Write an enzyme that holds these catalytic residues in place. Structure first.
Site, PDB file in Angstrom:
ATOM      1  N   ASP A 338       0.813  -1.144   0.000  1.00 21.37           N
ATOM      2  CA  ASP A 338       0.000   0.000   0.000  1.00 21.37           C
ATOM      3  C   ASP A 338       0.873   1.228   0.000  1.00 21.37           C
ATOM      4  O   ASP A 338       1.942   1.205   0.594  1.00 21.37           O
ATOM      5  CB  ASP A 338      -0.889  -0.024   1.273  1.00 21.37           C
ATOM      6  CG  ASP A 338      -2.011  -1.122   1.181  1.00 21.37           C
ATOM      7  OD1 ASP A 338      -2.259  -1.626   0.049  1.00 21.37           O
ATOM      8  OD2 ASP A 338      -2.657  -1.422   2.225  1.00 21.37           O
ATOM      9  N   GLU A 393       0.233  -0.497  -5.091  1.00 16.20           N
ATOM     10  CA  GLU A 393      -0.756   0.569  -5.099  1.00 16.20           C
ATOM     11  C   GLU A 393      -0.023   1.852  -5.487  1.00 16.20           C
ATOM     12  O   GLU A 393       0.641   2.458  -4.654  1.00 16.20           O
ATOM     13  CB  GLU A 393      -1.380   0.649  -3.710  1.00 16.20           C
ATOM     14  CG  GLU A 393      -2.535   1.679  -3.649  1.00 16.20           C
ATOM     15  CD  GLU A 393      -3.074   1.826  -2.204  1.00 16.20           C
ATOM     16  OE1 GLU A 393      -2.268   2.063  -1.274  1.00 16.20           O
ATOM     17  OE2 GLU A 393      -4.321   1.857  -2.025  1.00 16.20           O
TER      18      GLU A 393
END
Length: 693
Positions: A338, A393
């Site tokens: 992330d 991401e």
């Protein structure tokens, strides 16, 4: 370094930046060489969780904690009535503290499921008590300060250790991912458990023909409303939803149902909570003796969080060993990193702004320490599990983020198509239907690097900022509360919304990438939005739940969006279009509001017009013969009006000569004619006349 890279074959515009990539590759080889020399290589170095934290060996228990800034240190816990005087640790020249505690009558000195903390002081100050950085579980007391947390030694006896029964599934041809958060996965807005999620939600994911679960918010995070993004105890399974053994049950059950499971890895930042997380170890030392940079470089202004020094040896041990720990101990099939955009640039993408100009990607603003960590991480993970899928991401579109390290790239398998949900939200909120551009839709979906793989999704939870309304709710708003009965004909607004919810998800899947993602509840058009209790909503928690009751009743119409989602995934399973590089958009008809395209072996017709039926609408296709409906969103089983004939043969006509595009139809060498009612999408397949009839 050293000297042609295979990435340059793929994208010769990269050769302008040879100096950048020479330095990066040199830094990576040199870091890997040092880890081989000093730690026995990446596979050995990433077994740190057997060295650091609390490990029981035959007859004794060892604990190690890296804390170079401490001058005295002790282990404290329920086991010594929180007095460390007989449990003082010793410090080596690298600031690693260690103690070895013999068993007491044959039994481990530290009982399983008992509380512990690292106690240290410096500068002649008072004792500071923090949670060991490699603790595998942590719980809050909830005797005001609603905390802090305590570390928990987790070493369950045989009767309480989960043992995995199922092998990991094979890597699919394309990932169809069901993304989820276990604590908000229940009907009621109470924190749900891993066991509940495994028994109530995994079956639904497999029934809808997803093949992969993306599990958010696993690493422990003392702030619930962070949605798992502000991590405090990176080796600890978030305790509000159960224990480590409960998570192992959940992953094993997913595998039993044929589902791969990826975990969110939040190695882009760490919580600033001092009592509960790694920020407790910062007492003002220089960055070489910290997890974090200091000054501005160590602080993320938007996330109000700390930023790692990825060049520090102990931080590389910590983060690489954390990847191996989740893979090996919980049987994950991969991960999503992330916040990769923050890691890739010193400016973290905070005030930008990527135009796609390569100078923005490769410059002094590119964070080589972070890229070196990611390359070591992807080399390691694909060596441990060659079929792993590791997703990044990244909103920036960094080239070669998703090419293998051995080609010169960063080593991710896929990146998320982060720009597609923004387009649908702007369209849904700001543009009357007649002003939607078919060409702008296609450009947003198709605007990607074709040498690198993309996971597309039409909408998401929104929790990196604050949740927004779902596609369904943006279409239907407060009519969802009173207008979803299957007994009564739906209003025009409900009929519009159900049909566009199916069309927007299906065009996103078919044109947007090489994988698909759906967050929990959106497959059935769950209403409203997701939000967690915070000042900005007056501490409201009525949205941190999923109303399965809406999809589980046959008296409402949610079942119809759900049935379509199941069928769209089954269609992908059958035809494998996400893994096809054939993708040809043949018609972007603005006046009629029609988009026609081929992906793989299927021909797709999307009529976004509000009211016009096109009878005999000609569509281009590749192979001649006879086409039939493969999936029709107008079918009654998907809540439509049943206007399309599923038994109907669509015979092709030749359109000029193959490879003479001016003689073709929309640059296609054959065509056939369809019925295309308003707000429908239909995929057609060619009948194999040798094998079908």
């Amino acid at each position: 370094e050293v000297d042609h890279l295979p990435i340059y074959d793929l994208d010769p515009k990269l050769e302008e930046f040879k100096d950048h990539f020479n330095y990066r590759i040199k830094r990576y080889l040199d870091q890997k060489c040092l880890i081989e020399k000093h730690e026995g290589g990446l596979e050995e170095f990433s077994k740190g969780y057997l060295k650091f934290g609390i490990n029981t060996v035959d007859g004794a228990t060892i604990y190690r904690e890296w804390a170079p800034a401490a001058q005295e240190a002790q282990l404290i816990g329920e086991f010594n009535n929180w007095n460390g005087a007989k449990h003082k640790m010793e410090k080596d020249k690298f600031g690693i503290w260690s103690i070895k505690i013999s068993h007491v009558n044959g039994k481990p000195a530290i009982p399983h499921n008992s509380k512990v903390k690292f106690r240290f002081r410096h500068g002649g100050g008072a004792w500071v008590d923090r949670i060991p950085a490699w603790i595998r579980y942590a719980t809050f007391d909830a005797s005001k300060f609603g905390a802090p947390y305590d570390g928990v030694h987790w070493d369950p006896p045989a009767c309480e250790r989960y043992v995995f029964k199922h092998p990991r599934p094979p890597k699919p041809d394309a990932p169809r991912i069901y993304e989820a958060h276990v604590g908000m996965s229940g009907e009621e807005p109470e924190v749900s458990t891993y066991r509940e999620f495994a028994d109530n939600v995994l079956p639904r994911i497999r029934a809808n023909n997803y093949n992969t679960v993306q599990l958010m918010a696993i690493m422990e995070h003392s702030y619930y409303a962070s949605f798992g993004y502000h991590v405090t105890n990176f080796f600890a399974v978030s305790s509000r939803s159960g224990t480590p053994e409960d998570l192992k049950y959940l992953v094993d059950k997913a595998h039993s149902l044929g589902l791969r499971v990826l975990m969110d890895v939040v190695h882009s930042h760490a919580s600033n909570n001092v009592t509960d997380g790694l920020n407790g170890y910062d007492v003002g030392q220089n960055t070489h003796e910290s997890y974090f940079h200091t000054g501005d470089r160590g602080y993320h202004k938007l996330w109000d969080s700390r930023l790692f020094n990825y060049a520090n040896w102990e931080v590389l041990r910590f983060l690489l060993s954390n990847l191996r720990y989740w893979m090996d101990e919980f049987m994950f099939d991969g991960f999503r990193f992330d916040g990769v955009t923050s890691m890739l640039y010193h400016h973290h993408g905070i005030n930008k702004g990527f135009t796609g100009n390569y100078k923005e990607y490769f410059s002094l603003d590119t964070d080589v320490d972070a890229i070196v960590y990611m390359m070591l991480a992807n080399h390691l993970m694909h060596k441990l599990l060659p079929e792993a899928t590791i997703v990044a991401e990244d909103v920036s579109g960094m080239p070669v983020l998703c090419r293998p390290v051995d080609e010169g790239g960063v080593g991710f398998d896929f990146r998320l198509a982060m720009a597609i949900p923004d387009r649908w939200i702007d369209y849904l909120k700001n543009k009357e239907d007649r002003k939607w551009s078919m060409s702008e839709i296609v450009q947003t979906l198709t605007n990607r690097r074709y040498t690198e793989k993309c996971i597309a999704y039409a909408e998401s939870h929104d929790q990196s900022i604050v949740g927004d309304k779902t596609i369904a709710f943006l279409l239907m708003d407060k009519e969802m509360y009173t207008g979803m009965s299957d007994l009564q004909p739906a209003s025009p607004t409900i009929n519009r919304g159900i049909a566009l919810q199916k069309m927007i998800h299906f065009i996103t899947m078919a044109l947007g990438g090489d994988g698909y993602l759906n967050f929990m509840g959106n497959e059935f058009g769950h209403p409203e939005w997701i939000d967690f209790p915070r000042e900005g909503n007056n501490w409201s928690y009525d949205k941190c739940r999923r109303q399965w009751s809406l999809v589980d009743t046959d008296h409402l119409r949610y079942k119809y969006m759900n049935a379509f989602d199941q069928a769209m995934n089954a269609l992908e399973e059958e035809f494998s279009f996400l893994s096809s590089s054939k993708q040809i958009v043949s018609d972007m008809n603005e006046k009629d509001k029609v988009i026609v395209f081929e992906r793989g072996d299927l021909v797709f017709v999307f009529n976004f017009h509000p009211n016009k039926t096109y009878k005999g609408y000609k569509v281009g296709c590749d192979l001649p013969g006879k086409y039939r409906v493969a999936l029709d969103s107008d079918a009654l089983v998907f809540g439509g009006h049943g206007r399309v004939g599923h038994d109907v043969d669509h015979f092709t006509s030749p359109e000029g000569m193959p490879g003479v595009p001016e003689t073709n139809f929309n640059n296609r060498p054959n065509s056939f004619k369809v019925l295309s009612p308003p707000r429908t999408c239909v995929a057609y397949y060619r009948v194999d006349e040798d094998r079908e009839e």
